Design a protein around this ligand. Structure first.
Ligand SMILES: *[C@@H]1O[C@H](CO)[C@@H](O[C@@H]2O[C@H](CO)[C@@H](O[C@@H]3O[C@H](CO)[C@@H](O)[C@H](O)[C@@H]3O)[C@H](O)[C@H]2NC(C)=O)[C@H](O)[C@H]1NC(C)=O
Lengths: 100, 50
């Protein structure tokens, strides 16, 4: 993505930590997966790991979520060989202010 | 990995800094990608700067 809207855009994405090697492959058909997210200042290469985790809501795997800001014409690059949970919706901030 | 073209380069330099306190032998080991220091900055004095 190339920033166009003229303000910091909150881009929020995530990665999936599957609970089973079989479940990992049945979702992504490969292992040793990585999710790279790079901007003009941010660089983050998460490596999802499949391991036995306590049953929460019936699932063992989790979602790690990250958030970032595309400041000003800062092109963001998502790259992955799986496990990525992409954002289809970037939250541009309309205004500054004083909230809580 | 593919990174946005900054100054024509995609790759970056991560930089770290550390303090060798007192006869603390430092060991750099690498099979590549290391950017070594040939210059250690000893601090002459304490003080109050800004
Ligand atoms: C896509 O991302 C780039 C990030 O580099 C945004 O920056 C724009 O990049 C273009 C070249 O790709 C440049 O435009 C230049 O404008 C000057 C103004 O006189 C002109 O003389 C040049 O011929 C060239 O057209 C410039 O670095 C920059 N444009 C700006 C800041 O207005 C680019 O805006 C992004 N594309 C979008 C948002 O559509």
């Amino acid at each position: 993505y190339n920033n166009t809207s003229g303000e910091q855009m909150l881009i929020i994405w995530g990665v999936h930590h599957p609970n089973d090697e079989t479940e990992q492959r049945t979702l992504y058909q490969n292992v040793g997966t990585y999710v790279s997210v790079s901007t003009s200042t941010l660089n983050k290469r998460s490596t999802p790991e499949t391991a036995t985790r306590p049953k929460v809501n019936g699932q063992g795997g989790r979602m790690e979520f990250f958030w970032t800001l595309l400041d000003m014409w800062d092109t963001i690059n998502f790259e992955s060989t799986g496990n990525l949970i992409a954002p289809e919706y970037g939250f541009k901030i309309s205004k500054r202010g004083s909230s809580g």
